[PDB]
Design an enzyme around this catalytic site. Structure first.
Site, mmCIF file in Angstrom:
data_model
loop_
_atom_site.group_PDB
_atom_site.id
_atom_site.type_symbol
_atom_site.label_atom_id
_atom_site.label_comp_id
_atom_site.label_asym_id
_atom_site.label_seq_id
_atom_site.Cartn_x
_atom_site.Cartn_y
_atom_site.Cartn_z
ATOM 1 N N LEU A 109 0.816 -1.006 0.112
ATOM 2 C CA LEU A 109 0.141 -0.136 -0.011
ATOM 3 C C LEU A 109 0.793 1.228 0.089
ATOM 4 O O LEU A 109 1.468 1.392 0.831
ATOM 5 C CB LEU A 109 -0.929 -0.021 1.281
ATOM 6 N N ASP A 157 7.487 1.623 -20.224
ATOM 7 C CA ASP A 157 6.395 2.650 -19.957
ATOM 8 C C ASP A 157 6.910 3.498 -18.572
ATOM 9 O O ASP A 157 6.127 3.792 -17.919
ATOM 10 C CB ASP A 157 4.879 2.232 -19.919
ATOM 11 N N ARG A 186 3.089 8.562 -14.147
ATOM 12 C CA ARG A 186 1.708 7.875 -13.861
ATOM 13 C C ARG A 186 1.662 6.595 -13.291
ATOM 14 O O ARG A 186 0.933 6.081 -12.783
ATOM 15 C CB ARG A 186 0.813 7.865 -14.876
ATOM 16 N N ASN A 187 2.877 5.888 -13.685
ATOM 17 C CA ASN A 187 3.261 4.340 -13.284
ATOM 18 C C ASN A 187 4.097 4.356 -12.181
ATOM 19 O O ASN A 187 4.579 3.178 -11.880
ATOM 20 C CB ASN A 187 3.848 3.800 -14.501
ATOM 21 N N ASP A 203 3.380 0.093 -12.002
ATOM 22 C CA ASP A 203 2.504 -0.618 -12.890
ATOM 23 C C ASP A 203 3.645 -1.116 -13.977
ATOM 24 O O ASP A 203 4.564 -0.436 -14.595
ATOM 25 C CB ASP A 203 1.762 0.859 -13.698
HETATM 26 C C1 LIG Z 1 -2.571 -0.489 -8.851
HETATM 27 C C2 LIG Z 1 -2.511 0.649 -8.110
HETATM 28 O O1 LIG Z 1 -1.947 0.301 -6.677
HETATM 29 C C3 LIG Z 1 -1.928 1.270 -5.556
HETATM 30 C C4 LIG Z 1 -2.434 2.610 -5.463
HETATM 31 C C5 LIG Z 1 -2.337 3.495 -4.403
HETATM 32 C C6 LIG Z 1 -3.090 4.761 -4.278
HETATM 33 C C7 LIG Z 1 -3.667 5.356 -5.382
HETATM 34 N N1 LIG Z 1 -4.223 6.526 -4.962
HETATM 35 N N2 LIG Z 1 -4.115 6.496 -3.686
HETATM 36 C C8 LIG Z 1 -4.320 7.763 -2.848
HETATM 37 C C9 LIG Z 1 -5.366 7.349 -1.594
HETATM 38 C C10 LIG Z 1 -5.797 8.707 -0.753
HETATM 39 N N3 LIG Z 1 -4.508 9.350 -0.466
HETATM 40 C C11 LIG Z 1 -3.698 9.857 -1.593
HETATM 41 C C12 LIG Z 1 -3.167 8.498 -2.463
HETATM 42 C C13 LIG Z 1 -3.170 5.505 -3.248
HETATM 43 C C14 LIG Z 1 -1.592 2.717 -3.340
HETATM 44 N N4 LIG Z 1 -0.653 1.567 -3.501
HETATM 45 C C15 LIG Z 1 -0.905 0.830 -4.458
HETATM 46 N N5 LIG Z 1 -0.332 -0.276 -4.670
HETATM 47 C C16 LIG Z 1 -1.942 1.927 -9.073
HETATM 48 C C17 LIG Z 1 -2.548 3.125 -9.300
HETATM 49 CL CL1 LIG Z 1 -4.298 3.368 -8.808
HETATM 50 C C18 LIG Z 1 -1.880 3.944 -10.092
HETATM 51 C C19 LIG Z 1 -0.456 3.763 -10.428
HETATM 52 C C20 LIG Z 1 0.151 2.586 -10.117
HETATM 53 F F1 LIG Z 1 1.454 2.524 -10.567
HETATM 54 C C21 LIG Z 1 -0.284 1.621 -9.460
HETATM 55 CL CL2 LIG Z 1 0.282 0.401 -9.083
#
Ligand SMILES: C[C@@H](Oc1cc(-c2cnn(C3CCNCC3)c2)cnc1N)c1c(Cl)ccc(F)c1Cl
Length: 293
Positions: free
Chosen positions: A96, A147, A151-152, A168
């Site tokens: 996370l 990539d 964004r990733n 990503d």
């Molecule tokens: C698959 C998804 O995973 C996660 C998202 C997030 C995340 C997205 N958004 N937020 C917000 C939650 C509220 N506070 C600010 C950050 C946390 C955290 N850990 C992750 N492993 C993700 C997302 Cl959504 C976008 C880019 C990425 F490279 C990845 Cl790998």
């Protein structure tokens, strides 16, 4: 069932750590194809879901990304805690990253008259170093990301101790086995979008563009240009100008990453050294970031 090979050895679905579905609780959404949730297994996780309405190819893509991420072991690549594939909808469980994606972070944390010192040059250089270390790990293990872009990338937290990680791997998964309008052409070198040739030097070019994203504080690359316009621009030798207030030593790393011939671009060991030298230079890290009014 499909296999995946990395750093010497081969892995399969059976090698993934299956977490009992009963042990997984969803807490809240975190914002394309499939949803992401904050969850608990206690161990706090991010949950990537596969929609139950999907193709067989969608299933295999989902499986492959699980295999890919689970096989990495580096501090600047997001960890995979496990999967839950034996129940629907299917889950991948990730580290996370409370800071969220790098692009959103840069845009929402830009220095403001309310938050004059929300970010400094050193914070940006540290993010760049983090991702470059991740890229070096991929390069030395012969994995081409394809990539590399803000964004990733994800951040462990919004605050000062933050660590950036490559998160990503969807493009690499697709190629490992789509359309023109979905290709990240603004992050791609000439030989990539013209010949479909990918090497470690592909990622070097993309990293240069990421660096521009970082020091522009989250702008879209090639402002006002469409994909085809960028394609013709870059092919003709055109390159982005420095981001606002960007120190010359930092801009120079970008322009080295964007050398037309791949052989002329630095590998990530060299990029890391140059980022390190920037962090040492007072004239670089004492440079004020623009304050958005
Ligand atoms: C698959 C998804 O995973 C996660 C998202 C997030 C995340 C997205 N958004 N937020 C917000 C939650 C509220 N506070 C600010 C950050 C946390 C955290 N850990 C992750 N492993 C993700 C997302 Cl959504 C976008 C880019 C990425 F490279 C990845 Cl790998």
């Amino acid at each position: 069932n499909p296999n995946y090979c990395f750093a010497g050895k081969t892995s399969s679905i059976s090698d993934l750590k299956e977490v009992p579905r009963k042990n997984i609780t969803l807490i809240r959404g975190l914002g394309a194809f499939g949803e992401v949730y904050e969850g608990q297994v206690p161990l706090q996780v991010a949950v990537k879901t596969l929609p139950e309405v999907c193709s067989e190819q969608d299933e295999l893509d989902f499986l492959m990304e699980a295999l890919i991420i689970s096989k990495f072991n580096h501090q600047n690549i997001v960890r995979c805690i496990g999967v839950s594939l034996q129940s629907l909808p299917r889950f991948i469980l990730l580290e996370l990253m409370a800071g969220g994606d790098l692009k959103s972070f840069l845009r929402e944390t830009r220095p403001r008259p309310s938050q004059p010192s929300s970010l400094a040059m050193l914070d940006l250089l540290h993010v760049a170093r983090d991702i470059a270390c991740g890229c070096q790990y991929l390069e030395e293990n012969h994995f081409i990301h394809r990539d590399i872009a803000a964004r990733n990338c994800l951040l462990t937290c919004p605050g000062p101790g933050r660590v950036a990680k490559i998160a990503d791997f969807g493009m690499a998964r697709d190629i490992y086995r789509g359309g023109c309008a979905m290709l990240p052409v603004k992050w791609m070198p000439p030989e990539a979008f013209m010949e479909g040739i990918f090497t470690s030097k592909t990622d070097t070019w993309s990293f240069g563009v990421l660096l521009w994203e970082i020091f522009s504080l989250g702008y879209m690359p090639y402002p006002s240009k469409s994909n085809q316009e960028v394609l013709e621009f870059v092919t003709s030798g055109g390159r982005m100008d420095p981001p606002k207030n960007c120190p010359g030593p930092v801009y120079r790393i970008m322009t080295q990453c964007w050398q037309h011939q791949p052989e002329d671009r630095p590998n990530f060991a060299i990029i890391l050294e140059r980022i390190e030298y920037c962090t040492q230079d007072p004239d670089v890290i004492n440079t004020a970031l623009p304050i958005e009014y």
